[model samples]
Target chain A: QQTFXNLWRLLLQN
Target chain B: LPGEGTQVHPRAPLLQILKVAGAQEEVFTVKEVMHYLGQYIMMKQLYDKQRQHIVHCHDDPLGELLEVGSFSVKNPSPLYEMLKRNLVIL
Candidate 1:
């Protein structure tokens, strides 16, 4: 499973 | 460039779906897209009543976007699953 923090940094950052 | 990860253009049907939620961006990172989807779910009350972490899919937009009739997911599972598959790398 992907970590939410990683998801935020890897895919969320604007 | 955004470091190690990637951005994407949402697929055709999903474009309309995102438009409904007012996320009219040309390209979005996965997290950005999910935020719009969560916005849609929130406004539409797509979440299951008993278990707030689950979303009840509707046939019109969400189901058609996902190519399903009806289903419930544990909040973000199938959503991210479907989303990740339907995106074109931006």
Candidate 2:
């Protein structure tokens, strides 16, 4: 779950 | 980054999350939210890249707008307005 959350942040951030 | 298969890129997993989200109704089934998230990410990246290019390369009209805060221009762009509202992801 942490991996998924980190991916979300990476994909969402500019 | 080390605990995964190298054959598929990171985007594949990201897309898979979206696919899973797509299947859950009453929650993530709303296409508008997905579009907003997608557009938000795109515009955010575009804004950053444009700023960087202007700083490193040369001045551009877009860069001028960015410098002056074009997001507040009269009749703001749809994406900008959407981002301002702060009502999404439902």
Candidate 3:
């Protein structure tokens, strides 16, 4: 999975 | 500020970490180092499940090497600045 891409996804959730 | 000319080198302590992560390069860009460490975190699943962005100093090498109780992963700013303890702008 493209886990590194989630860095932004997580930030967006906050 | 963060350009190709700018290189990041791990401090003595981070070498202990990069070794575990199988870091092949002796140095990397500041941005690269950020990703490098973040990838290591993800690979080890060291991130807190509830918080998602926080890493607890739960184990020996991570806790002992990081020397911090915990740090946020919301963005590179937090982790990148904090990473100075282990990495330097070379």
Q: Whole-model lDDT for model 3 versus the true structure?
A: 0.62
Chain B alone, model 2: TM-score? Answer: 0.20
lDDT score for residue B79 of model 2: 27
Query: Each candidate's chain B TM-score?
Result: 0.77, 0.20, 0.70
lDDT on C-alpha atoms for all candidate structures: 0.63, 0.31, 0.62
What are the clashing pairs of model 2? none
Ranking by DockQ: 3, 1, 2
**Model 2 off-target regions past 4 Å?**
A1-14, B1-29, B46-90
- Stronger candidate by lDDT (1 vs 3): 1
Residue B56, candidate 2: C-alpha displacement in angstroms: 22
lDDT of 3 by residue, B51-86 (tens): 666676556466666556676655435454446666
Q: What tens-digit string does per-residue lDDT give for candidate 1 at B22-45?
A: 986778876677677766766677
Q: Chain A alone, model 2, TM-score?
A: 0.54
Winner on lDDT between 2 and 3 is: 3
Q: Name the regions of candidate 3 deviating beyond 4 angstroms.
A: A1-5, A8-14, B1-5, B75-78
